Symmetry: D2
Subunit: 99 residues, 4 copies
Amino acid sequence: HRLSAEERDQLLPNLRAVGWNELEGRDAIFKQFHFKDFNRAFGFMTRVALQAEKLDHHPEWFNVYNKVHITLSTHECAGLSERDINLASFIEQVAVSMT
Amino acid sequence: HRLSAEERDQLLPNLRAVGWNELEGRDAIFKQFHFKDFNRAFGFMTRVALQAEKLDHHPEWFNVYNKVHITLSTHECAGLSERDINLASFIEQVAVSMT
Amino acid sequence: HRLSAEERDQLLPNLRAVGWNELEGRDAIFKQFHFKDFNRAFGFMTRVALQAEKLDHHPEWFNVYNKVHITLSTHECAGLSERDINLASFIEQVAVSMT
Amino acid sequence: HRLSAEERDQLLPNLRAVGWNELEGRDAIFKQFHFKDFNRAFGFMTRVALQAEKLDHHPEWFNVYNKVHITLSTHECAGLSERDINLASFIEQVAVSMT
């Protein structure tokens, strides 16, 4: 679970490669996505929310018009678990659908 | 307003080349999109329904899992229109992002 | 799996009881729901979607503006399982929120 | 376009009843919501998006699992515009139904 140094290192990169940062202050990983419009920003949030239940691992996000900032980090192990590694991979896999 | 043939005949094809088409019993173009999973078929519907609402033009649709069949017309025209038309173009895009 | 006698006789009674009719041709239950607008008809569709994907059991729905028509049967059974039934009512409990 | 003194006094109150609050800093009301679960909250987030779409006046929101926090200001106005005053109001027409 609660990412080991050992793990967390090797999982983190690709995420790291795309904008996903570690948060100073908590064991979390954030990222803001800036779409082209609302229809997209929300088309995005949807497939993602359709997928946060599927897993029963929900994000911390915030949309305005076309930017959403997503913060991931497990409540169960008060940390970054593989759980959100997955979810983020999926999150990424979705934005790419959107422009 | 209701498409003439000069109209139908400029407008049409472009969508037709794509897979859209008149119904035999009535003035309306069908098309049935088919994705990879439910999640994608729904994100696609979320994207058109935001759109629908916006420009107040709705589809008669039908989804199962990952299949979604869309049929357009304009109700106060008893037939095709510019609306139907703008709509398929849209839906057409959104759809091209799901593959 | 394929809901049997008392089972049905005990379970189905309740749904018919709320307009859940029975399908002529398949082993399925169906329902059509009139909403006041699309703003509803879709805010519902979505909350049911979120669930059809939480339990991996999807509806067959058709939607025009405010109407929604739901057919439910498990095809792995090819017929009325539980699946329908406990989804039938989640889906009922939804329609109450808006209708 | 911007909400005079009068306007607020008539306009702003009732909203103020049910929870709406004006923040200090830029001109804008605010309102944390909390629902049973994420179905319920996204179910509500959608009807609300369908509308900010129909009307082109989008909220500024944050969603955790079931907690949803809204903030409405009007870019031009650099404060409350009649748009905001009613989007809150729809946003309540939505809310209650959920519970």
